[PDB]
Symmetry: D2
Subunit: 114 residues, 4 copies
């Protein structure tokens, strides 16, 4: 099934944070309404925060995470969890290889902020 | 119910990252086997990362997050989610005041790394 | 934090299903817009499905789960998970005693249906 | 990503319950250590319970859920959620058609019991 695609409340600020855990350079692209809004790149096998940014969900609320390693798309997993009916996390894992740890790039989206 | 307490696989490296969304300084303590292993503090109303670190779960695997603001422990909410039976997230939200947004300090624990 | 309260899409059918795992008779009450819409009850230490029902979330979409044992309110834990941005589960555990297994009555809410 | 595969604690009872929301008969197979341990069949567009059972996770703790409709394997989505470090839910959705509602057979696994 489609993964790494979330519908947020419209015109709402959210945080997006990417972590790396692989030998190869991870490229994370965050798209809002089908247009790239942040990009982070880096290599780490120690969960380096390769980028964090505050974005606005815009008119559509559509947020999509894509991950690649030197041009090759990684396979994604994702889900959303809501705590106390108020606190939202959208979670992405990605796999660039064969070991299926799905941690090669890890992306966490959180809202609301402030 | 108890919140902010997670059993990790023993002797496993994990990532812990905290964000702030509140007027007051957040202090985040991360305990491993009931001893403080990391402490983060900072202030942001824009989801700033107030700390990130890699720790080991130790012999017991017992990890606990506690949050203090303005001299008092915040009310916690938490859950653990596992994606594709491989990728683990331990998620914590906290409330230091009256509005119940639960985002005042947000803590993300992830494993495995590497 | 408040637990057992979920905001569902307005005017939308959902399934609610309750399981029992305790020596005492569980009573599960499902409130829609602050009014009892369903009540399930039974006694099992083997996950008996003490009730299942389809309800409509109504104009507000507010849904609350309350559990009691021998006329005493059980402590609740809850969260909502969303799969592939489309499939929703609202999850409730409850504790009636001292062992903190939180499985004494378990309630699963699922939408959409059809 | 592989979906509908869960590692449970070894030799532990768990509940498995399946619901149907589709025009076609859903067949749900539950495998423990790669051997079929339960099979549920049924048809409903109203979230009817097509089966419920308690099974033992065995020496491996490997549990896999498979869903088919008239012999055709359904695409799965899944996750595991743990509340208060105690109560576990393994959640599965499936899609047999083109509408991607992923509720055609919904499977809920829960543990511990008792
Ligand atoms: C070559 O494999 C890549 O790098 C390794 C060090 C591991 O992080 C593995 O998960 C990843 O897919
Ligand atoms: C008396 O304690 C109650 O019954 C027992 C059989 C257990 O299921 C326990 O979790 C429950 O709280
Ligand atoms: C033919 O399509 C199947 O039956 C319909 C009644 C819907 O439940 C749909 O989601 C399902 O895939
Ligand atoms: C700016 C405000 O600061 C504190 O009062 C928080 O509890 C609120 O949620 C908000 O972040
Ligand atoms: Ca990998
Ligand atoms: Ca890796
Ligand atoms: Ca607050
Ligand atoms: Ca706040
Ligand atoms: Ca109990
Ligand atoms: Ca019990
Ligand atoms: Ca369908
Ligand atoms: Ca359907």
């Amino acid at each position: 099934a489609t993964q790494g695609v979330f519908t947020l409340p419209a015109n709402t600020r959210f945080g997006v944070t990417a972590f790396a855990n692989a030998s190869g350079t991870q490229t994370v692209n965050v798209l809002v309404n089908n247009e790239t809004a942040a990009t982070f790149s880096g290599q780490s096998t120690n969960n380096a925060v390769i980028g964090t940014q505050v974005l606005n969900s815009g008119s559509s609320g559509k947020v999509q995470v894509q991950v690649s390693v030197n041009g090759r798309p990684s396979d994604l997993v994702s889900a959303q969890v809501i705590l106390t009916n108020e606190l939202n996390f959208a979670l992405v894992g990605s796999e660039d290889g064969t070991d299926n740890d799905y941690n090669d790039a890890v992306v966490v989206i959180n809202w609301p902020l402030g």
